[PDB]
Design a protein around this ligand. Sequence first.
Ligand SMILES: CCCCCCCCCCCCCCCCCC(=O)OC[C@H](COP(=O)(O)OCCN)OC(=O)CCCCCCCCCCCCCCCCC
Ligand SMILES: CCCCCCCCCCCCCCCCCC(=O)OC[C@H](COP(=O)(O)OCCN)OC(=O)CCCCCCCCCCCCCCCCC
Ligand SMILES: N=C(N)NC(=N)NCCc1ccc(I)c(Cl)c1
Lengths: 113, 171
Amino acid sequence: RATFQFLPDEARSLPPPKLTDPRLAFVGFLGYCSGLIDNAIRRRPVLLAGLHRQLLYITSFVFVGYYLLKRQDYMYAVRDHDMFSYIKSHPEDFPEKDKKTYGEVFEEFHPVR
Amino acid sequence: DSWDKDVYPEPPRRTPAPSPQTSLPNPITYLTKAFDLLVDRPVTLVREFIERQHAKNKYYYYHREFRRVPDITECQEKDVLCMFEAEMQWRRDYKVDQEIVNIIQERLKACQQREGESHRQNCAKELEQFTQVVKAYQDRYHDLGAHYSARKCLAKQKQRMLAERKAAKEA
Ligand SMILES: CCCCCCCCCCCCCCCCCC(=O)OC[C@H](COP(=O)(O)OCCN)OC(=O)CCCCCCCCCCCCCCCCC
Ligand SMILES: CCCCCCCCCCCCCCCCCC(=O)OC[C@H](COP(=O)(O)OCCN)OC(=O)CCCCCCCCCCCCCCCCC
Ligand SMILES: N=C(N)NC(=N)NCCc1ccc(I)c(Cl)c1
Protein backbone atom coordinates (compact mmCIF):
# COMPACT_ATOMS: atom_id res chain seq x y z
CA ARG A 1 0.00 0.00 0.00
CA ALA A 2 2.66 2.50 1.06
CA THR A 3 4.14 4.57 -1.74
CA PHE A 4 7.30 3.15 -3.35
CA GLN A 5 7.84 0.59 -0.61
CA PHE A 6 8.89 -2.99 -1.28
CA LEU A 7 7.35 -4.47 1.88
CA PRO A 8 4.85 -2.13 3.56
CA ASP A 9 4.71 -2.42 7.32
CA GLU A 10 1.24 -3.98 7.16
CA ALA A 11 2.91 -7.01 5.56
CA ARG A 12 4.43 -8.08 8.89
CA SER A 13 1.03 -9.32 10.07
CA LEU A 14 1.50 -12.16 7.55
CA PRO A 15 3.61 -15.28 8.15
CA PRO A 16 6.98 -15.22 6.39
CA PRO A 17 7.80 -17.85 3.76
CA LYS A 18 9.32 -20.91 5.35
CA LEU A 19 12.98 -21.47 4.54
CA THR A 20 11.90 -24.91 3.30
CA ASP A 21 9.40 -23.36 0.89
CA PRO A 22 9.33 -25.41 -2.34
CA ARG A 23 9.51 -22.21 -4.40
CA LEU A 24 12.57 -21.08 -2.44
CA ALA A 25 14.20 -24.47 -3.06
CA PHE A 26 13.58 -24.06 -6.78
CA VAL A 27 15.12 -20.58 -6.68
CA GLY A 28 18.14 -22.04 -4.91
CA PHE A 29 18.34 -24.71 -7.59
CA LEU A 30 18.44 -21.93 -10.18
CA GLY A 31 21.38 -20.42 -8.33
CA TYR A 32 23.08 -23.80 -8.53
CA CYS A 33 22.42 -23.99 -12.27
CA SER A 34 23.85 -20.48 -12.65
CA GLY A 35 27.01 -21.61 -10.88
CA LEU A 36 27.41 -24.57 -13.22
CA ILE A 37 26.83 -22.42 -16.30
CA ASP A 38 29.43 -19.99 -14.96
CA ASN A 39 32.01 -22.78 -14.81
CA ALA A 40 31.02 -24.16 -18.21
CA ILE A 41 31.36 -20.93 -20.17
CA ARG A 42 34.83 -20.35 -18.69
CA ARG A 43 35.98 -23.94 -19.36
CA ARG A 44 36.47 -24.81 -15.72
CA PRO A 45 35.64 -28.25 -14.27
CA VAL A 46 31.89 -27.79 -14.06
CA LEU A 47 31.06 -29.62 -10.84
CA LEU A 48 34.25 -29.09 -8.85
CA ALA A 49 35.75 -25.72 -9.76
CA GLY A 50 35.33 -22.77 -7.43
CA LEU A 51 32.96 -24.06 -4.78
CA HIS A 52 33.01 -20.70 -2.99
CA ARG A 53 31.71 -19.10 -6.18
CA GLN A 54 29.01 -21.77 -6.46
CA LEU A 55 28.02 -21.21 -2.84
CA LEU A 56 27.53 -17.49 -3.40
CA TYR A 57 25.40 -18.19 -6.47
CA ILE A 58 23.07 -20.35 -4.38
CA THR A 59 23.04 -18.01 -1.39
CA SER A 60 22.41 -14.84 -3.39
CA PHE A 61 19.56 -16.45 -5.36
CA VAL A 62 17.96 -17.68 -2.13
CA PHE A 63 18.48 -14.31 -0.44
CA VAL A 64 16.78 -12.29 -3.17
CA GLY A 65 14.18 -14.98 -3.77
CA TYR A 66 13.09 -14.97 -0.13
CA TYR A 67 12.13 -11.29 -0.30
CA LEU A 68 10.41 -11.66 -3.68
CA LEU A 69 8.28 -14.51 -2.32
CA LYS A 70 7.55 -12.46 0.79
CA ARG A 71 6.34 -9.62 -1.43
CA GLN A 72 4.52 -12.01 -3.76
CA ASP A 73 2.59 -13.51 -0.85
CA TYR A 74 1.82 -10.03 0.49
CA MET A 75 0.41 -8.75 -2.81
CA TYR A 76 -1.99 -11.69 -3.08
CA ALA A 77 -3.12 -11.10 0.50
CA VAL A 78 -3.84 -7.49 -0.46
CA ARG A 79 -5.81 -8.66 -3.50
CA ASP A 80 -7.96 -10.92 -1.34
CA HIS A 81 -8.38 -8.24 1.32
CA ASP A 82 -9.50 -5.66 -1.24
CA MET A 83 -11.92 -8.02 -2.97
CA PHE A 84 -13.70 -9.18 0.19
CA SER A 85 -13.93 -5.67 1.63
CA TYR A 86 -15.53 -4.53 -1.63
CA ILE A 87 -18.05 -7.39 -1.47
CA LYS A 88 -19.01 -6.35 2.06
CA SER A 89 -19.49 -2.73 0.97
CA HIS A 90 -21.79 -3.56 -1.98
CA PRO A 91 -24.06 -6.44 -0.92
CA GLU A 92 -26.66 -5.66 -3.57
CA ASP A 93 -24.06 -6.28 -6.29
CA PHE A 94 -23.23 -9.71 -4.82
CA PRO A 95 -26.57 -11.18 -3.77
CA GLU A 96 -26.68 -14.59 -2.16
CA LYS A 97 -28.71 -16.74 -4.53
CA ASP A 98 -31.41 -19.28 -3.77
CA LYS A 99 -29.98 -22.69 -4.62
CA LYS A 100 -32.19 -25.28 -6.31
CA THR A 101 -31.59 -29.01 -6.43
CA TYR A 102 -31.40 -31.02 -9.63
CA GLY A 103 -34.75 -32.64 -8.87
CA GLU A 104 -36.25 -29.18 -9.42
CA VAL A 105 -34.02 -27.75 -12.16
CA PHE A 106 -34.96 -28.73 -15.71
CA GLU A 107 -32.02 -29.73 -17.90
CA GLU A 108 -32.53 -30.86 -21.48
CA PHE A 109 -31.40 -34.36 -22.41
CA HIS A 110 -29.39 -34.77 -25.62
CA PRO A 111 -29.26 -38.44 -26.68
CA VAL A 112 -26.03 -39.87 -28.03
CA ARG A 113 -27.46 -42.21 -30.66
CA ASP B 1 -22.93 -76.21 -3.16
CA SER B 2 -21.07 -72.95 -3.93
CA TRP B 3 -23.58 -70.55 -5.52
CA ASP B 4 -27.13 -69.73 -4.50
CA LYS B 5 -29.69 -71.91 -6.25
CA ASP B 6 -32.21 -69.07 -6.12
CA VAL B 7 -30.08 -66.58 -8.04
CA TYR B 8 -29.11 -69.28 -10.57
CA PRO B 9 -32.03 -71.71 -10.72
CA GLU B 10 -31.83 -75.16 -12.27
CA PRO B 11 -34.91 -77.40 -12.71
CA PRO B 12 -34.78 -80.81 -11.02
CA ARG B 13 -32.74 -83.38 -12.92
CA ARG B 14 -34.58 -86.42 -14.34
CA THR B 15 -32.19 -89.00 -15.72
CA PRO B 16 -33.82 -92.18 -17.09
CA ALA B 17 -32.65 -95.48 -15.67
CA PRO B 18 -30.64 -97.81 -17.94
CA SER B 19 -32.87 -100.18 -19.90
CA PRO B 20 -30.54 -102.21 -22.12
CA GLN B 21 -32.33 -104.07 -24.90
CA THR B 22 -29.14 -105.62 -26.27
CA SER B 23 -26.97 -108.52 -25.18
CA LEU B 24 -23.83 -106.63 -26.15
CA PRO B 25 -21.69 -104.92 -23.51
CA ASN B 26 -21.92 -101.15 -23.31
CA PRO B 27 -18.45 -99.64 -23.94
CA ILE B 28 -19.42 -96.45 -22.10
CA THR B 29 -20.17 -98.37 -18.90
CA TYR B 30 -16.67 -99.84 -18.69
CA LEU B 31 -15.06 -96.57 -19.80
CA THR B 32 -16.91 -94.82 -16.98
CA LYS B 33 -15.59 -97.31 -14.42
CA ALA B 34 -12.05 -96.89 -15.73
CA PHE B 35 -12.43 -93.11 -15.55
CA ASP B 36 -13.54 -93.28 -11.91
CA LEU B 37 -10.61 -95.48 -10.93
CA LEU B 38 -7.81 -93.88 -12.95
CA VAL B 39 -8.91 -90.22 -12.95
CA ASP B 40 -11.56 -89.36 -10.38
CA ARG B 41 -10.01 -91.33 -7.51
CA PRO B 42 -6.41 -89.99 -7.63
CA VAL B 43 -7.70 -86.48 -8.38
CA THR B 44 -10.06 -86.67 -5.40
CA LEU B 45 -7.29 -87.73 -3.01
CA VAL B 46 -5.07 -84.87 -4.17
CA ARG B 47 -7.93 -82.46 -3.48
CA GLU B 48 -8.72 -83.99 -0.09
CA PHE B 49 -5.07 -83.45 0.78
CA ILE B 50 -5.27 -79.80 -0.26
CA GLU B 51 -8.47 -79.32 1.75
CA ARG B 52 -6.67 -80.66 4.82
CA GLN B 53 -4.16 -77.83 4.44
CA HIS B 54 -6.82 -75.14 3.96
CA ALA B 55 -8.60 -76.20 7.16
CA LYS B 56 -5.43 -75.59 9.19
CA ASN B 57 -5.37 -71.97 7.92
CA LYS B 58 -8.93 -70.65 7.96
CA TYR B 59 -9.38 -66.93 7.39
CA TYR B 60 -12.16 -64.73 6.09
CA TYR B 61 -12.88 -62.01 3.58
CA TYR B 62 -15.96 -59.83 3.41
CA HIS B 63 -18.32 -58.31 0.88
CA ARG B 64 -18.11 -54.53 1.00
CA GLU B 65 -21.31 -52.82 2.10
CA PHE B 66 -21.96 -49.31 0.79
CA ARG B 67 -24.19 -47.09 2.89
CA ARG B 68 -26.70 -45.05 0.91
CA VAL B 69 -25.98 -41.35 0.40
CA PRO B 70 -28.32 -38.72 -1.09
CA ASP B 71 -28.99 -39.00 -4.81
CA ILE B 72 -28.21 -36.31 -7.37
CA THR B 73 -31.86 -35.27 -7.01
CA GLU B 74 -31.06 -33.92 -3.53
CA CYS B 75 -27.89 -32.08 -4.56
CA GLN B 76 -27.91 -28.31 -4.88
CA GLU B 77 -26.62 -27.44 -8.32
CA LYS B 78 -22.85 -26.90 -8.62
CA ASP B 79 -22.37 -28.26 -5.07
CA VAL B 80 -19.49 -30.58 -5.91
CA LEU B 81 -19.11 -32.15 -2.47
CA CYS B 82 -22.64 -33.56 -2.50
CA MET B 83 -22.57 -34.08 -6.27
CA PHE B 84 -19.44 -36.21 -5.91
CA GLU B 85 -21.00 -38.67 -3.48
CA ALA B 86 -24.23 -38.96 -5.47
CA GLU B 87 -22.24 -39.39 -8.68
CA MET B 88 -20.07 -42.12 -7.16
CA GLN B 89 -23.17 -43.89 -5.88
CA TRP B 90 -24.84 -43.67 -9.28
CA ARG B 91 -21.76 -45.21 -10.90
CA ARG B 92 -21.74 -48.07 -8.39
CA ASP B 93 -25.40 -48.81 -9.09
CA TYR B 94 -24.72 -48.62 -12.83
CA LYS B 95 -22.12 -51.38 -12.63
CA VAL B 96 -24.38 -53.52 -10.44
CA ASP B 97 -27.26 -53.12 -12.90
CA GLN B 98 -24.95 -54.26 -15.69
CA GLU B 99 -24.24 -57.42 -13.71
CA ILE B 100 -27.95 -57.93 -13.03
CA VAL B 101 -28.65 -57.96 -16.76
CA ASN B 102 -25.78 -60.43 -17.09
CA ILE B 103 -27.38 -62.76 -14.54
CA ILE B 104 -30.68 -62.67 -16.41
CA GLN B 105 -28.88 -63.24 -19.71
CA GLU B 106 -27.02 -66.20 -18.20
CA ARG B 107 -30.28 -67.76 -17.01
CA LEU B 108 -31.68 -67.36 -20.51
CA LYS B 109 -28.68 -68.98 -22.18
CA ALA B 110 -28.60 -71.86 -19.70
CA CYS B 111 -32.28 -72.58 -20.32
CA GLN B 112 -31.86 -72.60 -24.10
CA GLN B 113 -29.12 -75.22 -23.89
CA ARG B 114 -30.81 -77.26 -21.17
CA GLU B 115 -34.17 -77.59 -22.93
CA GLY B 116 -32.76 -78.76 -26.26
CA GLU B 117 -35.25 -78.83 -29.11
CA SER B 118 -38.08 -77.82 -26.74
CA HIS B 119 -36.49 -74.50 -25.76
CA ARG B 120 -38.89 -72.35 -27.77
CA GLN B 121 -41.70 -73.27 -25.37
CA ASN B 122 -39.85 -74.28 -22.19
CA CYS B 123 -37.88 -71.01 -21.88
CA ALA B 124 -40.76 -68.55 -22.25
CA LYS B 125 -40.42 -67.40 -18.64
CA GLU B 126 -36.72 -66.65 -19.01
CA LEU B 127 -37.37 -64.84 -22.28
CA GLU B 128 -40.01 -62.68 -20.60
CA GLN B 129 -37.82 -61.88 -17.60
CA PHE B 130 -34.97 -61.00 -19.93
CA THR B 131 -37.24 -58.76 -21.99
CA GLN B 132 -38.45 -56.87 -18.91
CA VAL B 133 -35.00 -56.35 -17.40
CA VAL B 134 -33.51 -55.22 -20.72
CA LYS B 135 -36.35 -52.72 -21.11
CA ALA B 136 -35.68 -51.30 -17.64
CA TYR B 137 -31.93 -51.15 -18.25
CA GLN B 138 -32.47 -49.40 -21.59
CA ASP B 139 -34.68 -46.78 -19.95
CA ARG B 140 -32.15 -46.06 -17.22
CA TYR B 141 -28.92 -46.02 -19.17
CA HIS B 142 -29.32 -46.10 -22.96
CA ASP B 143 -28.14 -43.20 -25.14
CA LEU B 144 -26.33 -41.39 -22.32
CA GLY B 145 -23.02 -41.37 -24.19
CA ALA B 146 -19.43 -41.97 -23.16
CA HIS B 147 -19.55 -39.01 -20.76
CA TYR B 148 -22.56 -40.35 -18.88
CA SER B 149 -23.35 -39.14 -15.38
CA ALA B 150 -26.10 -39.04 -12.80
CA ARG B 151 -27.00 -35.58 -14.12
CA LYS B 152 -27.53 -36.92 -17.63
CA CYS B 153 -29.47 -39.92 -16.30
CA LEU B 154 -31.78 -37.55 -14.43
CA ALA B 155 -32.36 -35.45 -17.54
CA LYS B 156 -33.23 -38.60 -19.48
CA GLN B 157 -35.67 -39.66 -16.77
CA LYS B 158 -37.33 -36.24 -16.60
CA GLN B 159 -37.80 -36.22 -20.37
CA ARG B 160 -39.37 -39.67 -20.17
CA MET B 161 -41.59 -38.66 -17.25
CA LEU B 162 -42.75 -35.54 -19.09
CA ALA B 163 -43.82 -37.57 -22.12
CA GLU B 164 -45.68 -40.02 -19.88
CA ARG B 165 -47.54 -37.12 -18.27
CA LYS B 166 -48.51 -35.74 -21.68
CA ALA B 167 -49.68 -39.10 -23.01
CA ALA B 168 -51.91 -39.50 -19.96
CA LYS B 169 -53.16 -35.94 -20.49
CA GLU B 170 -54.44 -37.18 -23.85
CA ALA B 171 -56.49 -39.89 -22.11
C1 LIG C 1 18.84 -33.50 -9.25
C2 LIG C 1 19.27 -32.69 -10.47
C3 LIG C 1 18.44 -33.11 -11.67
C4 LIG C 1 18.92 -32.36 -12.91
C5 LIG C 1 17.89 -31.29 -13.29
C6 LIG C 1 18.37 -30.54 -14.53
C7 LIG C 1 17.45 -29.35 -14.79
C8 LIG C 1 18.04 -28.49 -15.91
C9 LIG C 1 19.19 -27.65 -15.37
C10 LIG C 1 19.90 -26.96 -16.52
C11 LIG C 1 21.26 -26.47 -16.04
C12 LIG C 1 22.28 -27.60 -16.20
C13 LIG C 1 23.62 -27.16 -15.63
C14 LIG C 1 24.32 -26.22 -16.60
C15 LIG C 1 25.14 -27.04 -17.60
C16 LIG C 1 26.47 -27.41 -16.95
C17 LIG C 1 26.92 -28.78 -17.41
C18 LIG C 1 27.68 -28.66 -18.72
O1 LIG C 1 27.57 -27.66 -19.34
O2 LIG C 1 28.51 -29.68 -19.21
C19 LIG C 1 28.45 -30.93 -18.57
C20 LIG C 1 29.47 -30.95 -17.43
C21 LIG C 1 30.49 -32.05 -17.67
O3 LIG C 1 31.38 -31.64 -18.67
P1 LIG C 1 32.69 -30.72 -18.30
O4 LIG C 1 32.53 -29.35 -18.91
O5 LIG C 1 33.92 -31.37 -18.87
O6 LIG C 1 32.89 -30.54 -16.67
C22 LIG C 1 33.37 -31.60 -15.90
C23 LIG C 1 32.64 -31.60 -14.55
N1 LIG C 1 32.64 -32.94 -13.99
O7 LIG C 1 28.82 -31.08 -16.19
C24 LIG C 1 28.48 -32.36 -15.72
O8 LIG C 1 29.32 -33.15 -15.45
C25 LIG C 1 27.02 -32.74 -15.50
C26 LIG C 1 26.22 -31.51 -15.06
C27 LIG C 1 24.74 -31.68 -15.39
C28 LIG C 1 24.53 -31.74 -16.90
C29 LIG C 1 23.36 -30.86 -17.32
C30 LIG C 1 22.98 -31.19 -18.76
C31 LIG C 1 22.03 -30.12 -19.31
C32 LIG C 1 20.59 -30.63 -19.28
C33 LIG C 1 19.72 -29.69 -20.11
C34 LIG C 1 18.45 -30.41 -20.55
C35 LIG C 1 17.22 -29.64 -20.08
C36 LIG C 1 16.86 -30.07 -18.66
C37 LIG C 1 15.78 -31.14 -18.69
C38 LIG C 1 14.42 -30.50 -18.97
C39 LIG C 1 13.48 -30.73 -17.78
C40 LIG C 1 13.88 -29.80 -16.63
C41 LIG C 1 13.49 -30.44 -15.30
C1 LIG D 1 13.34 -14.04 -9.54
C2 LIG D 1 13.54 -15.33 -8.74
C3 LIG D 1 14.98 -15.80 -8.92
C4 LIG D 1 15.91 -14.86 -8.16
C5 LIG D 1 16.87 -14.19 -9.14
C6 LIG D 1 17.85 -13.37 -8.31
C7 LIG D 1 18.87 -12.70 -9.23
C8 LIG D 1 19.69 -11.70 -8.42
C9 LIG D 1 20.54 -12.41 -7.37
C10 LIG D 1 22.01 -12.10 -7.61
C11 LIG D 1 22.49 -12.87 -8.83
C12 LIG D 1 24.00 -12.68 -8.99
C13 LIG D 1 24.73 -13.60 -8.02
C14 LIG D 1 26.19 -13.72 -8.42
C15 LIG D 1 26.83 -14.80 -7.55
C16 LIG D 1 28.29 -15.01 -7.96
C17 LIG D 1 29.18 -14.00 -7.25
C18 LIG D 1 30.58 -14.57 -7.10
O1 LIG D 1 30.72 -15.73 -6.93
O2 LIG D 1 31.70 -13.75 -7.14
C19 LIG D 1 32.89 -14.39 -6.79
C20 LIG D 1 34.05 -13.41 -6.94
C21 LIG D 1 33.57 -12.04 -6.45
O3 LIG D 1 33.05 -12.13 -5.16
P1 LIG D 1 33.12 -10.74 -4.26
O4 LIG D 1 32.47 -9.63 -5.04
O5 LIG D 1 34.56 -10.40 -3.99
O6 LIG D 1 32.34 -10.91 -2.82
C22 LIG D 1 32.41 -9.83 -1.94
C23 LIG D 1 31.29 -8.84 -2.25
N1 LIG D 1 31.50 -7.60 -1.52
O7 LIG D 1 34.54 -13.22 -8.25
C24 LIG D 1 34.17 -14.04 -9.30
O8 LIG D 1 34.99 -14.73 -9.80
C25 LIG D 1 32.74 -14.04 -9.83
C26 LIG D 1 32.69 -14.08 -11.35
C27 LIG D 1 31.30 -14.53 -11.81
C28 LIG D 1 30.29 -13.40 -11.64
C29 LIG D 1 29.63 -13.01 -12.97
C30 LIG D 1 29.74 -11.50 -13.18
C31 LIG D 1 28.87 -10.78 -12.15
C32 LIG D 1 29.74 -10.05 -11.12
C33 LIG D 1 29.16 -10.26 -9.72
C34 LIG D 1 30.07 -9.56 -8.70
C35 LIG D 1 29.82 -10.08 -7.28
C36 LIG D 1 28.33 -10.33 -7.05
C37 LIG D 1 28.04 -10.47 -5.56
C38 LIG D 1 26.60 -10.98 -5.41
C39 LIG D 1 25.95 -10.47 -4.13
C40 LIG D 1 24.46 -10.27 -4.37
C41 LIG D 1 23.70 -10.32 -3.05
N1 LIG E 1 -6.24 -5.01 -14.34
C1 LIG E 1 -5.66 -3.89 -13.81
N2 LIG E 1 -5.34 -2.99 -14.80
N3 LIG E 1 -5.48 -3.74 -12.52
C2 LIG E 1 -5.40 -4.87 -11.75
N4 LIG E 1 -4.14 -5.38 -11.51
N5 LIG E 1 -6.54 -5.32 -11.34
C3 LIG E 1 -6.58 -6.54 -10.53
C4 LIG E 1 -6.45 -6.26 -9.03
C5 LIG E 1 -5.25 -6.84 -8.31
C6 LIG E 1 -4.56 -7.93 -8.81
C7 LIG E 1 -3.47 -8.43 -8.12
C8 LIG E 1 -3.07 -7.84 -6.92
I1 LIG E 1 -1.41 -8.65 -5.93
C9 LIG E 1 -3.77 -6.75 -6.41
CL1 LIG E 1 -3.30 -6.01 -4.93
C10 LIG E 1 -4.87 -6.25 -7.11
